[PDB]
Enzyme design. Structure first.
Site, PDB file in Angstrom:
ATOM      1  NE  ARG A  54      37.248  35.992  39.536  1.00 13.84           N
ATOM      2  CZ  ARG A  54      37.752  36.300  40.731  1.00 13.84           C
ATOM      3  NH1 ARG A  54      37.038  36.168  41.839  1.00 13.84           N
ATOM      4  NH2 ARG A  54      38.996  36.771  40.824  1.00 13.84           N
ATOM      5  CG  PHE A  59      31.751  28.841  39.209  1.00 16.08           C
ATOM      6  CD1 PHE A  59      31.059  28.496  40.372  1.00 16.08           C
ATOM      7  CD2 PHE A  59      33.025  29.361  39.337  1.00 16.08           C
ATOM      8  CE1 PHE A  59      31.617  28.679  41.624  1.00 16.08           C
ATOM      9  CE2 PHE A  59      33.585  29.546  40.594  1.00 16.08           C
ATOM     10  CZ  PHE A  59      32.889  29.188  41.735  1.00 16.08           C
ATOM     11  CD  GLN A  62      33.738  37.240  42.684  1.00 23.13           C
ATOM     12  OE1 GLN A  62      34.126  36.214  42.129  1.00 23.13           O
ATOM     13  NE2 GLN A  62      34.462  37.868  43.595  1.00 23.13           N
ATOM     14  CG  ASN A 101      35.303  34.377  51.580  1.00 22.73           C
ATOM     15  OD1 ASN A 101      36.335  33.867  51.120  1.00 22.73           O
ATOM     16  ND2 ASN A 101      34.264  33.644  52.014  1.00 22.73           N
ATOM     17  CG  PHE A 112      29.248  34.050  44.354  1.00 21.35           C
ATOM     18  CD1 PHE A 112      29.900  34.341  45.559  1.00 21.35           C
ATOM     19  CD2 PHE A 112      28.807  32.732  44.142  1.00 21.35           C
ATOM     20  CE1 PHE A 112      30.104  33.360  46.514  1.00 21.35           C
ATOM     21  CE2 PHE A 112      29.027  31.748  45.097  1.00 21.35           C
ATOM     22  CZ  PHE A 112      29.667  32.060  46.289  1.00 21.35           C
ATOM     23  CG  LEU A 121      31.891  27.666  46.551  1.00 26.38           C
ATOM     24  CD1 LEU A 121      31.343  28.879  45.798  1.00 26.38           C
ATOM     25  CD2 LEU A 121      33.390  27.773  46.740  1.00 26.38           C
ATOM     26  CG  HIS A 125      32.258  31.499  49.550  1.00 25.15           C
ATOM     27  ND1 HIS A 125      32.816  32.682  49.117  1.00 25.15           N
ATOM     28  CD2 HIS A 125      33.175  30.537  49.316  1.00 25.15           C
ATOM     29  CE1 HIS A 125      34.021  32.430  48.630  1.00 25.15           C
ATOM     30  NE2 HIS A 125      34.260  31.136  48.733  1.00 25.15           N
TER      31      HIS A 125
HETATM   32  C1  JV2 Z   1      37.461  32.971  41.433  1.00 19.36           C
HETATM   33  S1  JV2 Z   1      36.342  31.691  41.071  1.00 19.36           S
HETATM   34  C2  JV2 Z   1      36.320  30.984  42.686  1.00 19.36           C
HETATM   35  C3  JV2 Z   1      36.919  29.732  42.914  1.00 19.36           C
HETATM   36  C4  JV2 Z   1      36.896  29.152  44.179  1.00 19.36           C
HETATM   37  C5  JV2 Z   1      36.239  29.814  45.218  1.00 19.36           C
HETATM   38  C6  JV2 Z   1      35.644  31.048  44.988  1.00 19.36           C
HETATM   39  C7  JV2 Z   1      35.686  31.680  43.755  1.00 19.36           C
HETATM   40  C8  JV2 Z   1      34.978  33.032  43.544  1.00 19.36           C
HETATM   41  C9  JV2 Z   1      33.643  32.824  42.815  1.00 19.36           C
HETATM   42  C10 JV2 Z   1      32.685  32.636  43.989  1.00 19.36           C
HETATM   43  C11 JV2 Z   1      33.199  33.665  45.020  1.00 19.36           C
HETATM   44  N1  JV2 Z   1      34.638  33.745  44.776  1.00 19.36           N
HETATM   45  C12 JV2 Z   1      35.478  34.404  45.588  1.00 19.36           C
HETATM   46  O1  JV2 Z   1      35.014  34.947  46.586  1.00 19.36           O
HETATM   47  C13 JV2 Z   1      36.964  34.405  45.226  1.00 19.36           C
HETATM   48  N2  JV2 Z   1      37.585  35.373  46.087  1.00 19.36           N
HETATM   49  C14 JV2 Z   1      37.561  36.666  45.734  1.00 19.36           C
HETATM   50  O2  JV2 Z   1      37.115  37.031  44.633  1.00 19.36           O
HETATM   51  N3  JV2 Z   1      38.058  37.525  46.640  1.00 19.36           N
HETATM   52  C15 JV2 Z   1      38.123  38.951  46.427  1.00 19.36           C
HETATM   53  C16 JV2 Z   1      37.558  39.705  47.628  1.00 19.36           C
HETATM   54  C17 JV2 Z   1      36.332  39.345  48.181  1.00 19.36           C
HETATM   55  C18 JV2 Z   1      35.783  40.059  49.236  1.00 19.36           C
HETATM   56  C19 JV2 Z   1      36.472  41.165  49.757  1.00 19.36           C
HETATM   57  C20 JV2 Z   1      37.685  41.541  49.199  1.00 19.36           C
HETATM   58  C21 JV2 Z   1      38.228  40.801  48.147  1.00 19.36           C
HETATM   59  C22 JV2 Z   1      38.470  42.709  49.776  1.00 19.36           C
HETATM   60  C23 JV2 Z   1      37.491  43.720  50.390  1.00 19.36           C
HETATM   61  C24 JV2 Z   1      36.645  43.010  51.456  1.00 19.36           C
HETATM   62  N4  JV2 Z   1      35.901  41.910  50.810  1.00 19.36           N
HETATM   63  C25 JV2 Z   1      37.552  42.453  52.562  1.00 19.36           C
HETATM   64  O3  JV2 Z   1      38.096  43.555  53.311  1.00 19.36           O
HETATM   65  C26 JV2 Z   1      38.689  41.614  51.979  1.00 19.36           C
HETATM   66  O4  JV2 Z   1      39.322  42.285  50.878  1.00 19.36           O
END
Ligand code: JV2
Length: 164
Positions: A54, A59, A62, A101, A112, A121, A125
């Site tokens: 991603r 921004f 990731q 997360n 990221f 954030l 985060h």
């Molecule tokens: C998508 S733009 C965005 C917009 C607003 C806030 C954040 C974001 C974006 C850009 C920056 C970081 N981010 C985010 O973090 C979005 N959230 C995920 O992409 N989440 C998937 C995700 C992450 C970690 C983990 C797992 C799944 C799995 C495995 C393990 N870690 C755990 O056990 C939980 O389940």
């Protein structure tokens, strides 16, 4: 002191260069150690051969889903998830390295690298390092992204490790 680690990144099988990251073990030792070990692969799994799944221009970029390669997966050296260590470091600008997360206390391996200040954030985060060199490589990665996050080329961490 703090680890220095590296990511060597390709786009469609052709090298973009190397990103060097400082991991703030002085502030977030457990989070820094997780990333460090996933770079070396010393626990038997890690970032080598996984993708930036991603990438959103103006921004962040990731990566780190080395299990499912689609943003749903990854795992930590401790287990499938680990707590938010602290929120002491802030998303102050481009080059910040922070954990992706799925809500509170769900850190795994996804991470990221910011290409702007993402202060909205903060407190959500865990920030754990920053880019030392290779911000130009992060910009190259960024250029293959889109507002949807889908990349126009396959962006792969071909190699990674620790420099000191
Ligand atoms: C998508 S733009 C965005 C917009 C607003 C806030 C954040 C974001 C974006 C850009 C920056 C970081 N981010 C985010 O973090 C979005 N959230 C995920 O992409 N989440 C998937 C995700 C992450 C970690 C983990 C797992 C799944 C799995 C495995 C393990 N870690 C755990 O056990 C939980 O389940």
């Amino acid at each position: 002191g703090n680890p220095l680690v590296y990511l060597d990144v390709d786009a469609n099988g052709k090298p973009l260069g190397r990103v060097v990251l400082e991991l703030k073990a002085d502030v977030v030792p457990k989070t820094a150690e997780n990333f460090r070990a996933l770079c070396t692969g010393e626990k038997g799994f890690g970032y080598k051969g996984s993708t930036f799944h991603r990438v959103i221009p103006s921004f962040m970029c990731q990566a780190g889903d080395f299990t499912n390669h689609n943003g749903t997966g990854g795992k930590s050296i401790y287990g499938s998830r680990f707590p938010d260590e602290n929120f002491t470091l802030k998303h102050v600008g481009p080059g910040v390295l922070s954990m992706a997360n799925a809500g509170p206390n769900t850190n795994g391996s996804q991470f990221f690298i910011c290409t702007i200040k993402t202060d909205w954030l903060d407190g959500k985060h865990v920030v754990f390092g920053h880019v030392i060199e290779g911000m130009d490589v992060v910009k190259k990665i960024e250029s293959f992204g889109s507002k949807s996050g889908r990349t126009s080329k396959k962006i792969v961490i071909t190699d990674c490790g620790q420099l000191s």
